[PDB]
């Protein structure tokens, strides 16, 4: 009745199996394409990603891998790579270094409480934080310099 690769009521449905760039499928007796395990799409040319792979930041060419776009990492490829060499900072988007309370700047390696951490004012001076690794030494009588050391 039906010729090779022709199926259906009046043999009007065409299907010839493929295992290439255009598809990874066999054919059923209704003339529909049955994707090979790990293949997706009406033509089975697209690969099924690792269960949980990020739709925007992760892609496929082999099942079930989850390769990453520059600036993204992890199994599910959902975590940003912070800017090198980010210390006390995190990211929302790639190459970001968002400091917490209290660090700066850019790499979040510069102290916002440099006075509390280091006590740079000597010989009875007063320290007050003025920014990332920045301080102010208010010196008593007989003492000068950036740390009241002269």
């Amino acid at each position: 009745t039906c010729d090779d690769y022709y199926y259906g009521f009046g043999c009007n449905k065409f299907c010839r199996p493929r295992d290439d760039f255009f598809g990874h499928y066999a054919c059923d007796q209704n003339g529909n394409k049955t994707c090979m395990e790990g293949w997706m799409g009406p033509e089975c040319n697209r690969a099924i990603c690792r269960q949980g792979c990020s739709p925007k930041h992760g892609s496929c060419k082999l099942p079930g891998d989850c390769r990453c776009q520059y600036g993204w990492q992890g199994l599910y490829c959902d975590k940003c790579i912070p800017h090198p060499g980010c210390v006390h900072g995190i990211c929302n988007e790639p190459w970001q270094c968002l400091c917490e309370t209290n660090w700066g700047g850019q790499l979040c390696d510069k102290d916002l409480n440099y006075c509390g951490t280091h006590q740079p004012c000597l010989n009875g001076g007063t320290c007050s934080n003025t920014g990332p690794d920045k301080y102010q030494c208010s010196c008593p009588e007989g003492y000068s310099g950036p740390n009241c050391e002269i």
Partner: antibody, heavy 116, light 108 residues
Framework: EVQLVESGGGLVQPGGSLRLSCAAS????????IHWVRQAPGKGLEWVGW????????DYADSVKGRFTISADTSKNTAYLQMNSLRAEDTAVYYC?????????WGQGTLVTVSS | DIQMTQSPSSLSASVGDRVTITCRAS??????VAWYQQKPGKAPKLLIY???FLYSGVPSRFSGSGSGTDFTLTISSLQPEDFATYYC?????????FGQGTKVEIKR
């Protein structure tokens, strides 16, 4: 893990016949397919042909067409290659590879030597 | 009946050398190109697929580039265990075609 083992290869008289088996394991056999790639001594890789276990479809290279027949058995998880009218040109290491994997999984290969 | 042509046929390089093997397709085959490493007496081992995608477990020193008709394989820093016959392959059609091969020898 995915395992493909080729058996059957040996000395065959020219014009003779030989059947090779590709014993697959570690995956759902019906979900993929099997390809056959041969490599003549000191020569490159040559795709002999392929089979869908689901449906029973076959395709061959023009070099092996008519003489070579590829078959399968989902219940044994084995694909076969019946070689007939064996020419000297057929002397090669015959490998079987899983379909739908961009040729990531190959077997160790079996040696078919066509000689009097 | 697409043809895959590799260049060079053979090459000798020292450890740490950048090795470049080229492959030309007779027709346009998009990114449907794979690269393999074959040690004599062993089955070919997949290195690169989709012309530029590194297969799992393959050292990062192996990379691939190309789209259309010209494809290249790169071994950034050659190692002593990298001696083999390398093959490019097209899977634009189910009846896959392979390049003749490129032998890589290690100088010392």
């Amino acid at each position: 893990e995915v395992q493909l083992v080729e058996s059957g290869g040996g000395l065959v008289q020219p014009g003779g016949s030989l059947r090779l088996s590709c014993a697959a394991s570690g995956f759902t056999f019906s979900n993929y397919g099997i390809h056959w790639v041969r490599q003549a001594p000191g020569k490159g890789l040559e795709w002999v042909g392929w089979i869908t276990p689901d449906g029973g479809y076959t395709d061959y290279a023009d070099s092996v067409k008519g003489r070579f027949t590829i078959s399968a058995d989902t219940s044994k998880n084995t694909a076969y290659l019946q070689m007939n009218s064996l020419r000297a040109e057929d002397t090669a290491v015959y490998y079987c590879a899983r379909a739908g994997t961009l040729f990531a999984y190959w077997g160790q290969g079996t040696l078919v030597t066509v000689s009097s | 009946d697409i043809q895959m042509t590799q260049s060079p046929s053979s090459l000798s390089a020292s450890v740490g050398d950048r090795v470049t093997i080229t492959c030309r397709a007779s027709q346009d085959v998009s990114t449907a190109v794979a690269w393999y490493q074959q040690k004599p007496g062993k089955a070919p081992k997949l290195l690169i697929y989709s012309a530029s995608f590194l297969y799992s477990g393959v050292p990062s020193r192996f990379s691939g580039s190309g789209s259309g008709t010209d494809f290249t394989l790169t071994i950034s820093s050659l190692q002593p265990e990298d001696f083999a016959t390398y093959y490019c392959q097209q899977y634009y059609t189910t009846a896959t075609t392979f390049g003749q091969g490129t032998k890589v020898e290690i100088k010392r």
